[PDB]
């Protein structure tokens, strides 16, 4: 039967609808918060960069400049020239590029041969030239600073201060998106980290921020039959489960668990101290909604059967529960309850030490699957875990100014203690949220993301003349839903991580064999990376096999295994300033050790309350650095792919209009359009390149007597690859 989603993803003019007035009040005076537009400011810097190329040509200082940075200049010029639509602005760039090409051809003949092999392969050669550490050399700002001998406008200063680290941040939209997608490819050594004068700078969050500010504000529409839109009648609770004290198994929080002859469980969940009746109804109807649609959503969790939602006397409840070891229920005499039937596995949390590694990975794979399948359906779960307004932010550097890294996580094992991920799959689905609530000024986003919705102040943003504070950050009021989306993907995967970390710390303690615990933690790090790749594949359709490879180009599973083992066990607590300083070297191996001045508590580790381990020092960041690299590599693969595919299809429409005669132009500009479309195909995805090969061949029919010498080489590579695939799909014999 049918399988599809009740949510449609579109676009909207702005998310800046009925948000807080963009004002910061400081010491009685109210300061308006104004946006520094990203595209206008970036385009200005390119025009400044172009005029500085001219001045460099006119100074005859072309020998005073290393050959590697003339190639970047030249290659970026020829890339910018192909990205520009009209032929006249394309000739100002080519006119600027020609002297740099004449000097290299004459005074640097080897670099000329190498970059010409790049020019023949792609139409944005600079993106392949910067698939390595050359991306850390900001050749454009160097040139501007050297030959634009005039102070930059305040907006231009703000931009470079925020995007110091790489010249890619100045690239026009299609070139930046293509570089960022290909920076994960198999032949790329680029990693967003570089060592300054013995200082190490990480800027992976800058990659995501520079991309998000080029995005259009997303909007999600839920159909009329969606759970949060279709009006259903009342809930029929005409059967009453009859509670007996001998049949009760266990008391889990505010839910009583009863035995049945069929070895499953009848659970009756009682009203919390301050929960209204409608919350337990919503849990009823959501369980009903998921059951009806399990086949259409391919839900893997074993969903409970909702049986009744009705009121009972408090006299009756406390008489039944007088036996076991048991506060969190309402004042007196009449308590609405929610009664449901569920397997026994629905009540074992996913961090239970009593799971073999085999059921653990299968259970995580079930939970990970349904979290993101349900995110596409338009349902988000903001309360998977008490991960604590004081709520933790998975991508904190995109949602605030002045923040730089993931903060400390307090009592981290207690934060997933009652996590809503079980062996059966997802659980406690009543406290959910429509995805449209991340894209609007709901009560959720107003309380938890006030800074992102207001606009952001900082003393260096304040301009004494106009009385306003200006920043790139205020520009995200128009886009804030795009941030909360990626932050939601990230905090799903953070909770998976803490769940795996809880399981790992409980299995490894009361265990002696040192290799048998490094095998467990290495397998958990593999579970965590696989989980990230399954999320990418559910959100983008990239095969999870290739999503894994692109993930491990960016995030190091070896470092992640060792950091998790180090910081989520209490073993480092039995150490001194000298032994751990040399054990921190093994888990970072090129990077600054985790600096902290707290006094450790024995048997626990870092602890503010002395009893439960935290993940990080008091007002310091989290020590799981590869985890934050992994979360950002994941959201950047997801959003970067979506952006690349939009750019791919916007150029596909141009090629089709050139072929059908709807845009009358010559043959060279036709082959330019097709080759440009090849650069926008996903890394490692062949059918996209096969499609572009099909268009190239039809262009050779519309313009039969046109030279293809500039393009035959790159499309023959796609032809030979396509031919090989059909031969290797003939291993119908092992």
């Amino acid at each position: 039967v049918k399988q599809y989603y009740f949510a449609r993803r579109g676009e909207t003019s702005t998310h800046d609808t009925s948000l807080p007035p963009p004002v910061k009040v400081l010491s009685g005076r109210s300061i308006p918060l104004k946006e520094i537009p990203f595209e206008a400011t970036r385009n200005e810097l390119v025009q400044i960069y172009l005029t500085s190329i001219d001045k460099l040509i006119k100074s005859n200082k072309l020998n005073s400049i290393p050959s590697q940075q003339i190639a970047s200049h030249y290659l970026f010029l020829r890339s910018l020239a192909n990205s520009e639509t009209d032929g006249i602005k394309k000739n100002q760039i080519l006119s600027l590029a020609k002297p740099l090409g004449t000097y290299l051809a004459s005074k640097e003949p080897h670099v000329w041969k190498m970059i010409n092999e790049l020019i023949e392969k792609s139409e944005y050669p600079i993106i392949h030239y910067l698939k390595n550490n050359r991306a850390h050399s900001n050749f454009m700002l160097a040139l501007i600073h050297e030959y634009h001998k005039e102070p930059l406008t305040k907006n231009q200063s703000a931009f470079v201060q925020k995007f110091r680290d790489s010249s890619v941040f100045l690239f026009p939209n299609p070139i930046y998106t293509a570089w960022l997608a290909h920076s994960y490819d198999e032949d790329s050594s680029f990693n967003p980290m570089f060592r300054e004068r013995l200082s190490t700078n990480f800027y992976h969050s800058t990659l995501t921020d520079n991309l998000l500010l080029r995005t259009e504000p997303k909007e999600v529409t839920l159909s009329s039959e969606h759970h949060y839109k279709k009006e259903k009648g009342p809930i029929d609770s005409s059967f009453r489960y009859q509670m007996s004290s001998d049949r009760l198994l266990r008391i889990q929080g505010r839910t009583l668990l009863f035995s049945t002859p069929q070895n499953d469980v009848v659970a009756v969940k009682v009203q919390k101290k301050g929960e209204p009746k409608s919350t337990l109804e919503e849990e009823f109807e959501m369980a009903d909604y998921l059951l009806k649609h399990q086949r259409r959503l391919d839900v893997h969790s074993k969903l409970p059967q909702p049986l009744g939602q009705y009121s009972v006397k408090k006299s009756e409840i406390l008489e039944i529960s007088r036996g076991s070891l048991d506060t969190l229920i309402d004042d007196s005499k009449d308590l609405e309850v929610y009664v449901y039937k569920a397997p026994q596995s629905y009540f074992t949390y996913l961090h239970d030490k009593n799971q073999d590694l085999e059921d653990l990975t299968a259970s995580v794979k079930t939970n990970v699957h349904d979290l993101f399948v349900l995110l596409r359906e338009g349902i988000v779960f903001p309360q998977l875990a008490d991960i604590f307004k004081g709520r933790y932010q998975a991508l904190v550097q995109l949602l605030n100014v002045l923040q730089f890294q993931l903060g400390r996580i307090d009592k981290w094992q207690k934060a997933v203690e009652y996590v809503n991920l079980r062996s059966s799959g997802l659980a406690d689905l009543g406290d959910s949220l429509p995805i449209t609530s991340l894209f609007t000024s709901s009560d959720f986003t107003k309380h938890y993301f006030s800074e992102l919705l207001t606009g952001g102040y900082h003393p260096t943003f304040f301009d004494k003349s106009s009385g306003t504070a200006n920043s790139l950050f205020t520009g995200k009021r128009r886009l804030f839903g795009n941030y909360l989306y990626l932050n939601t993907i990230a905090e799903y995967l953070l909770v998976i991580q803490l769940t795996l970390g809880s399981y790992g710390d409980k299995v490894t303690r009361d265990m002696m064999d040192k290799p048998k615990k490094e095998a467990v933690w290495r397998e958990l790090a593999n579970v965590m990376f696989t989980s990230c790749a399954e999320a990418i594949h559910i959100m983008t359709g990239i095969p999870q096999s290739r999503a894994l490879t692109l993930l491990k180009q960016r995030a190091n599973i070896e470092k992640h295994f060792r950091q998790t083992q180090f910081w989520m066990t209490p073993d480092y607590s039995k150490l001194d300033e000298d032994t751990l300083q040399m054990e921190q070297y093994s888990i970072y191996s090129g990077e600054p050790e985790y600096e902290f001045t707290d006094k450790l508590v024995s048997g626990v580790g870092l602890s503010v309350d002395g009893v439960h381990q935290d993940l990080g020092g008091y007002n310091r960041e989290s020590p799981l650095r590869e985890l934050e690299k992994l979360l950002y590599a994941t959201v950047t693969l997801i959003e970067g792919t979506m952006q690349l595919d939009k750019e791919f299809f916007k150029q596909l429409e141009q090629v089709e209009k050139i072929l059908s005669g709807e845009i009358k132009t010559d043959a060279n500009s036709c082959f330019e359009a097709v080759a440009q479309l090849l650069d926008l195909a996903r890394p490692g995805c062949h059918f996209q390149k096969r499609l572009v090969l099909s268009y190239y061949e039809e262009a050779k029919l519309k313009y039969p007597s046109a030279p293809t010498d500039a393009y035959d080489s790159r499309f023959q590579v796609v032809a030979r690859t396509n031919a090989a695939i059909t031969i290797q799909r003939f291993w119908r014999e092992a």
Binding site: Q3, R376, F687, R690, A719, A723, T726, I727, W731
Partner: protein
């Protein structure tokens, strides 16, 4: 299901890439180019299962065995090697079958270059 796993991976990728609203369904006016990116270029692919009016991935996949179990692979296979033969009618350049391209498990020979098909 008459289709092995390296095909539904490409089909699910291509279906996902061309469903621009994240629906789970693609319009009739788009699977033409989805078709073109996969290899099959027909003119009228109608009489389909119209119960949903567009198609699911479920409908999309099962339609393809109606199309690739009908594609005689021998003609898809000679041009596959007419492509790698520059002159008419090799063994080392074929060693690139996967030494650069793809799956590189336990290759074979017949050298003495290769000439024509061999299905077995």
């Amino acid at each position: 299901d008459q289709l092995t796993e390296e095909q539904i991976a490409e089909f699910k990728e291509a279906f996902s890439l061309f469903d621009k609203d994240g629906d789970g369904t693609i319009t009739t006016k788009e699977l033409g180019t989805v078709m073109r990116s996969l290899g099959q270029n027909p003119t009228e692919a109608e009489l389909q299962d119209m119960i949903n009016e567009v198609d699911a991935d479920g409908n999309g996949t099962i339609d393809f065995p109606e199309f690739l179990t009908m594609m005689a692979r021998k003609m898809k296979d000679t041009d596959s090697e007419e492509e790698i033969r520059e002159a008419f009618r090799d063994k080392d350049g074929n060693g690139y079958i996967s030494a650069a391209e793809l799956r590189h498990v336990m290759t074979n020979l017949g050298e003495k270059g290769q000439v024509n098909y061999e299905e077995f």
